[PDB]
Symmetry: D3
């Protein structure tokens, strides 16, 4: 077992899908996995294991923020033999040509955190995903008919930022969406030698919030998950 | 109803106790509060409100990490009329003469996070707790005949630090315990004008690696809740 | 005899009061201490030792600035057996509801200096005062029927700041007063294991530019000394 | 005509290859481009424009360092309508498994430079290449049966770094090759909305170097240019 | 008058010599000035005005540290019409080929303070003296027979440094001596448009402290002062 | 033979002039040096060695930017026994009184680069020229009846700075000219114990530029080289 995960070696697949919300991790195991079993529930951070089209897959929440997801991804990679981590979450839009319900894939992730400077002797560590995972994700989305955008994400430490003028900067350097974990997970993946990726759906538009209809918002979230799950099979081949 | 809290103005008391563990909030509600009802469950971040010796009080977890508890403490303060926040969590010991199960009262909190530098034009902001609350707790402890060291805590962004040499520095400066939220909570309290205090139970020792055990886990965590609840009454006097 | 203090082990009491003004130390020795003798005059940094209501106490200025008071507090602590240090100085007000002659008790001290970042591996060190001393003073004040706000001070390196916009930031965060030594003294106290507290008399207002006047200068500065001297006795009880 | 480029709008193609040595721009124009024509000579920075299998292509050296390549790539993007920039050159390996003559593609570029911090409000900007250009280069290499590795690069400001342990860090974080431009080129592209890529060949292994001949070394170089050239065409579809 | 200087326009010469110690400023007025009058004594920081070989000159202490000397030099330049400031003090040796009783002139001054970064938007401001003053000083020392060294000084914030390994760095980059004000005065001079210079005599050798004989040490301090005073006359011509 | 300089020890004189444009190294060798002989061609960085009035002198371009000039000046100092380095070039004025064609001598060089911070433990290193070389250049100019100004220069990493108010700061602190090498050359000299100087001519006034002819512009340039050349001889005594 582990300080934050009460399970044993074998309980998880070598691939773990991670939503920020635990209740959302249960929703995924319910909707897409066959024969899903709960493998952890410490602090209410639900984790499940099952199979998709015959492939052993796991899904577990990682909580909000870099400090939170860092603890979990680290314990999985170094104590449960996990090799891949695909974060499937939500992000806010900054660029105008980016619309609600757009699937974005973070090849890289900018940040206002200090975690990577701490690991990188205070220089700039470019937090990036695994190239193959990005490609698998891009090819799966195409098969499903979705036109995914691949670029930079911004991982913020303050959801309720004091500044706000930093949003002008993000849009200027082409940031595709803002969330809160990418840069942290990538930093962890680099540190312990595993592979990670982050896919997001635009939850709202910083510029002008607002959304469409629940039915459509939920269809796009499912499209994202199918791309995540399908990209894995694709990577097995 | 806020982005992460599904409740209406009135569901929460003007005073909230906050453990990182959602399940611990529930354990507290079931053991110390009377006629307590659940006011939140969004993202499983369970919140409760009942009464303690007549007084109305609430308890809700904040998850792990500064960015996590920042969101929660901020929404309660600006959309639910919360005036006091008392985090009740666990920490790691760095000093030899600091035992497991020990109770520490953070008058201040150091940190390796950037949230505060972003707020204070990159200068050093002394994240300190509210004085009266620090005193109410010190008294509540003396009345309960319980021990409690008052001092500096260290709010870390990385539970699994890549720089262990920083623990000597933490020790050299007498840091009582290592947790992950204090400096963030104290930062937000100041930003939105509120009062906060952090109380912690030494759950483990960083040098000796000794992790909690026996039924001395709960009980010790029962004194921490005792002191917090009682320190509120003194504050009401 | 240290590099900047010409005295021998024993000349100083275990408790020293320290104003920035050397002449003020002398005024204090002549008005509050009994059978006081001069123990230092190197660089004109006058030091005195006498008794107050039976207790042996010393008073010596520290000059202006963190680097200045750092030298002095460090030599007293390591070569004269000093255990407590209580700075008694003046500060500038930033908040509207903070009047001239007001007494502030620095529980913490923010800063734009680098001395602490150099000590804390470039992280945020919460420079806080010793808790019991903060309490002894708050009581000494209540007994004297004197008012005294307890909170954060701001230790500036530049009295004539080139960035006045930082005062809004200081205000926004409720900084009680602007002085130039607190964070340095609290830093040294921690480094060489000692206890310190800073008490200040609002000598001017940064917004209104109102500078002290009338015979209300001295007297107000007489309450500050009163509280300090008395807070020591309480601490002896 | 820009300050450093004496030529008119239309002289350069929408795509430009950039070697370090300006002498290399000539070799490429003569060894690979059809109907070539010099288009710049300022400061000796030789630049040509020709065609590769019907596709108009330009080639021009950029000098050593981020400050240099930054002015060139900027003027081209803002004053000659350049849409894509492919940098070709050499780098030093730090990983044991990365061998001399290995081809490396910088999907991302770390750096010890401050240019991006100055651009991104002193936060962490992830300098990444354009995903499609990356994928094109990989596919094109596969076509030529060459083995290309996709990862992080490190843009050092000092070819002679007074610091040595920094190479240990780079290794620990899987840096593929060390060079001096990628991070600067990526920041500019992001700044003025253009696409860029960096492809390198391991010239030296810093740690342990073998012995490459000028014969082998030109083959690898020509292999890199074919990869860069064929990738454009794929990019074209 | 001024907050720290109780004098009036006209009381000081347009040239001010400033030793760190006030008692030393009186020693200078006594030994080298004709018809010297005390023009300030606030906080015991003695200031004098008189003439040398018919030239009106002033001399006043500036206290220890950048925060201290910054307040005084600023008040003199902007409230008492001072145009030149020559700091005459003591410094510690770092380079072996630098011997006790060597007169060093700081053309520039490195620092561990954060004052200049605050004035210079966080970049590197090279704190330097006025070229003519450096030359006058160099020519005067020659007339007197002294062989002055002209180079860099290091202005420290912590006289009792936590590090100490920074001394290896200073010697490596050729620092001539370490004191505590130069960088601050130069920053002030640049900010308010006046001219400043710093001359120092090696008080000891960090490498191996120790000194010669009082008679010789005091002869060299007087040589320094004569160079300071003589350089002024030289500058008048 | 160094990585960037294909030549042997003895090929370069103890003194080397360095222009930005490598084409300029040729013009100087032919227009001013006797018995000139090319000594390097790598990457097109042309370098020559001849004599000026019996004095052996070398000339070679260094490229644009601190990262570039840093490798060249380093290899020369450590591998060809170069004792002094004089950089000659142009810069942009930011002060109103500094006119086009004005000659400027950088006694110091500010910068927005991180190279010196990386070298000096993240503290402020004052990048200064060698005082005697500075004085020689001034005297030599006077001889040629030219008006030279001695002050601070600013070494910008980005010729196209996204930040604009930074020019206001530079003006406020009396910066004389903006360029891109001085601070890097000075850091290297300090690092390997050598002497260096930078002399510039105002080419543009950034703010308001007039109209200089290629006729006038060459005269100023030749005036600068005579100053640089005559100063060496004075340096020789
Ligand atoms: N504009 C935004 N700023 C910060 N986090 C955001 C934003 N939009 C969506 N998120 C993400 O969604 C959650 C908060 O609602 C977090 O998990 C965070 O990653
Ligand atoms: N040794 C430790 N280091 C850091 N955080 C700790 C430690 N022990 C307990 N914690 C706390 O518990 C959680 C991490 O397990 C966080 O909420 C943090 O406050
Ligand atoms: N407005 C102010 N700003 C900064 N320091 C002040 C101010 N007013 C009083 N002080 C204090 O008095 C001295 C400067 O006059 C320092 O010792 C400092 O603590
Ligand atoms: N080992 C290496 N370290 C740093 N830069 C290198 C190295 N090998 C090749 N280069 C590259 O070649 C040039 C320096 O010779 C620079 O343009 C740089 O990108
Ligand atoms: N080694 C040293 N470190 C710091 N300050 C020094 C040193 N040697 C001499 N000084 C100077 O002398 C005084 C302290 O004795 C201060 O004014 C300071 O400038
Ligand atoms: N206005 C200017 N700004 C920045 N660098 C300049 C300027 N004018 C001339 N230069 C110099 O000339 C080159 C850029 O054209 C660089 O080597 C730089 O030193």
């Amino acid at each position: 077992a582990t300080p934050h995960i009460n399970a044993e070696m074998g309980d998880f697949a070598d691939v773990v899908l991670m939503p920020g919300d635990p209740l959302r991790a249960k929703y995924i195991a319910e909707t897409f996995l066959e024969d899903a079993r709960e493998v952890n529930n410490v602090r209410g951070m639900l984790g499940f294991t099952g199979t998709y089209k015959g492939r052993k897959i796991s899904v577990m929440g990682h909580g909000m923020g870099i400090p939170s997801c860092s603890i979990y991804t680290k314990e999985l990679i170094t104590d449960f033999g996990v090799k891949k981590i695909i974060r499937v979450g939500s992000c806010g839009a900054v660029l105008p040509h980016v619309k609600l319900r757009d699937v974005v894939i973070g090849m890289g992730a900018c940040t206002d955190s200090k975690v990577n400077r701490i690991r990188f002797k205070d220089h700039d560590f470019a937090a990036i995903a695994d190239f193959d995972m990005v490609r698998n994700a891009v090819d799966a989305a195409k098969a499903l008919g979705i036109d995914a955008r691949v670029g930079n994400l911004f991982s913020a430490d303050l959801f309720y930022s004091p500044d706000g003028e930093m949003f002008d900067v993000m849009e200027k350097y082409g940031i595709l969406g803002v969330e809160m974990e990418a840069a942290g997970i990538y930093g962890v993946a680099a540190e312990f030698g595993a592979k990670a990726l982050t896919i997001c759906t635009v939850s709202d538009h910083i510029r002008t919030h607002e959304q469409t209809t629940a039915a459509e918002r939920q269809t796009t979230f499912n499209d994202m998950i199918k791309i995540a799950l399908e990209s894995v099979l694709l990577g097995d081949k």
